[PDB]
Structures are given as C-alpha cells and as structure tokens.
Amino acid sequence: IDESKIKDTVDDLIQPLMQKNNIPGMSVAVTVNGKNYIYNYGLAAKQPQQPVTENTLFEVGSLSKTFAATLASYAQVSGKLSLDQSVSHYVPELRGSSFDHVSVLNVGTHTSGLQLFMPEDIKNTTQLMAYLKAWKPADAAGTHRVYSNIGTGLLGMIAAKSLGVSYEDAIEKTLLPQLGMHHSYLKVPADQMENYAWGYNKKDEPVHVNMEILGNEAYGIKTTSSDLLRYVQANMGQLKLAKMQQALTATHTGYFKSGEITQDLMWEQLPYPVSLPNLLTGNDMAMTKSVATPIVPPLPPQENVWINKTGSTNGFGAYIAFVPAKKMGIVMLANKNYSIDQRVTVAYKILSSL
Ligand SMILES: C=C1CS[C@H]([C@@](C=O)(NC(=O)Cc2cccs2)OC)N=C1C(=O)O
C-alpha cells in the first residue's frame, strides 16, 4: 500500500512538471525501506515515437563527476593516490607550473581555481598541456570554490593513471561492472542505441552530447534510472557488491564549507532535516566563485545529511539526492534540461512525503 501512495505522490508532481516545461520523457526512481520504485513517463523519442521504459538510457551530464570522484577514492583506499599531494606530483609535465601548488584534493573539491568550461579550442592532449602549463589562478588554490569541468577532468585522469588504466577502461571495465551497473556507459553500444533517449534542446531539436577532451570524466555517463538507483543504494551501504564500499563511502568526506553547502569529493551535502530555501541556495553555485573554508580534520562521512548532485546536458536534466540516516534516495532523469530549482523542489517534496 505504501507503493500506491508513493506512486500517487510522484505522479501528481511529475505530470504537471512535464506539462509546463514541455519535457517529453522522464524516469523517477525512489528507494525507501529497502524497496525500489521506478516510474516512467512519456517519450524517449518523439519521431519515430518511443516510450520511456525500464531500459531507457539518459544523459546525466555533471552527475558524471561523482564517478570520477569514486574512481579517485578507489585509488586512494587502494594506496595508489594521496589527495594532499600536488597535481604535478602525478602529472610530471606540469612540474614547475601553478600545479606545483594545487593539490589533488583541490581539483576534487572545485578549489583549484580552474574555470568552469574547457576552452573550446583545446582538442588534444598537447593543447591541453600547453594551457595547463601557462595557467595561473586568480586566488591561491584552496581559498575559493569555482565549480570546474577542467578540475574534474584532471581528478579522473590522475585517478585512472594511478590505477594503471585509461579513464574509459577504469569506468567501463572496472568501476561500473563492480557496482553492478551493467546498463551504464561512456559509449553506448550498438545493441543499446535503440534505448538511448534523444535529448530535446531549447529549440526542441533532438540532440545527443558531443564528447570532447576530458569529457568522459566531467559529463560522459549515459545510464538508466535503475542503474543510478543501484548507485545510490551502494552509496548508502545497502548492497553486498571491500575496497569498493570503502571508496564509495569515502567520497562523502566533507572537505570545505562554502555558502550553505559542505563540499565532499564532488558530492555536495546539506544538513538534515533540510531547509528547502537552503537547498535551493546550495544548488545555485555552479557558475560563480564563492569563498571556501577548509574543514580540517575533514568531516567523516555522515548519516544525518542530505547528499546530492545535479547534472544536465543541452538535451537532458538530472538530479540525485539521498539521506543515509533514512536509507532513502531519489533519481530524477529527463530528456529536456529544465531548471534546477524545479528538480530540487520536486525531489524535496517526494522525499518529505515518505
Ligand atoms: C548552470 C550549469 C550547472 S553545471 C552544468 C554541467 C553539469 O551538468 N553541464 C554538463 O555537464 C554538460 C556540458 C555542456 C557544455 C560543457 S559540459 O556542467 C558544466 N551545466 C550548466 C550550464 O548552464 O551550462
């Protein structure tokens, strides 16, 4: 009977949300009391029409950053990576540059000072390294938070190299298989292309994300809501799957305070019980610089917190939130990018109903 009540709550919020934002398709996955509920709505593609099903793959954009963090954490608990070491310690071509004074932790917490977007002209590793060797932050690393795809890219690159593999092999051959996420990909295979939803951009054109340099680390994941709910459950220790569980949990370590949030290793967290005003403010930090204050010793992974991450691409919008103390979590996937405040408000209303 709790299943029907949850479905009513979700239906009543998602259907008006899709109508007013012209979202073609959504999947919403909820976990509570050890049980999983998956609700699918609308169309994965308009023409030819295809419904959202249990197998539908969505782009998740910036949610991909948490997989780079999980990989770095795995390297750390495996003794291959020290987060307090400098980036140039692991990337010898950057020795003598600004990255002598940037830690791996800094790129894992958006405190290096690197900008949000990769310069558009950077196509290959030679161009990337020339940019990084010439780069200087406006403030000292560790003093401000600037959300960065470039920093995330370095975090994943360094983690993979420390494990002896490419980032693509690290994710698709080790991390996702060991998490049981068998319908999660950086590159969708031919037998799954029929399941890969189209995204609909601001002009309502069908689009798929273009993968550029260090893009897999920052925005490359395509996945089902069921696989992401497994990822949420693994982050709450609910699944058998010991290094992997240690790695997942350690990504929730709190390293910096900024505004309303605690910045973990890519994950962000808020106090629980959660204030909706503070949750909205905390999810409006992607494009501006803020002051960052270190938490030292770091805050251990907590139960009594709201942990979350947003993601989008030109054609998709995604959100994950979970509260370990209540073993509850939510995944919301859509094939239109609609505003973060609406994602977070719907998620807050669903989890508050439980
Ligand atoms: C406001 C934000 C939050 S942050 C988000 C995000 C992660 O979701 N976009 C992507 O991952 C997909 C990419 C598009 C171009 C390079 S990447 O990070 C840039 N984008 C934006 C944006 O308005 O562009």
Q: Is 319 annotated as a binding residue?
A: no
- Looking from the CA of residue 311, the nearest atom of ligand 1 is 8
| Residues in CB range of 311: below 8 A, 6 or more apart | 60, 61, 62, 63, 64, 65, 219, 317, 318, 319
Q: Is 312 annotated as a binding residue?
A: yes
Q: Please, are residues 24 and 35 in contact by the beta-carbon 8 Å criterion?
A: no
d(CA 333, CA 183): 15
Q: Indicate if ligand 1 lies below 6 Å from the C-beta of 312.
A: yes
Instruction: Cite the beta strand spans of 13-167 per DSSP E.
Output: 25-32, 35-46, 49-51, 58-59, 144-145
Cite the beta strand spans of 79-229 per DSSP E.
Answer: 144-145, 184-185, 199-200, 206-207, 222-223
Contact 217, 167 (CB under 8 A): yes
Instruction: With CA atoms as reference, report the closest residue to 321 among 32, 124, 8.
Output: 32
Q: Which atom of ligand 1 is nearest to the CA of 64?
A: 11
Q: Is the CB of 62 under 6 A from ligand 1?
A: yes
Report the SS3 class of residue 208.
coil
Give the CA radius of gyration of the chain.
19
Record the tokens describing residue 207, joined without a space. Answer: 């689009």
Catalytic residue among 27, 62, 103, 258: 62
Q: Alpha-carbon dihedral of residues 67, 227, 220, 166, nearest 10 degrees?
A: 60
User: Does the annotation count 338 as an active-site position?
Assistant: no
Ligand 1 midpoint to CA 311 (Å): 7
- Provide the resolution (angstroms): 1.6
Give residue 34's region: left, alpha or beta (phi > 0; psi -120 to 50).
Answer: left
The H or E element containing residue 107 is: helix 104-108
Domain 1-354 is found in CATH 3.40.710.10: yes
Q: What are phi and psi of 298, to 5 degrees?
A: -60, 150
Residue 184 annotated as binding site: no
Residues linked to residue 330 through DSSP beta bridges, in sequence order: 30, 321
337 lines ligand 1 (CB under 6 A): no
Contact 235, 272 (CB under 8 A): no
The number of angstroms, rounded, from the C-alpha of 298 to the middle of its chain's C-alpha atoms is: 21
Structure tokens that stand for 59 in this block = 């782009």
- Protein residue with its CA nearest to atom 4 in ligand 1: 286
Dihedral in degrees, nearest 10, Cα atoms 189, 195, 199, 205: 100
Separation CA 265–CA 253 (nearest Å) = 7
Ranges of H-type helices in 135-197: 149-162, 167-169, 176-178
CA–CA gap between residue 82 and residue 73 (Å, rounded)? 10
Contact assessment for residue 95 and residue 251, using Cβ atoms and an 8 Å cutoff: no
Gap from CA of 312 to ligand 1 centroid (Å): 6
- Alpha carbon separation from 16 to 19, 21, 27, 296 (Å, rounded): 5, 8, 14, 45
Task: Identify whether 131 is a catalytic site residue.
Answer: no
Host H or E run for residue 129: helix 125-134
Q: Which residues of 6-31 are buried (b: 16+ CB within 10 A; e: fewer)?
A: beebbeebbeebbeeeebbbbbbbbb
Tokens of 291: 């002051």
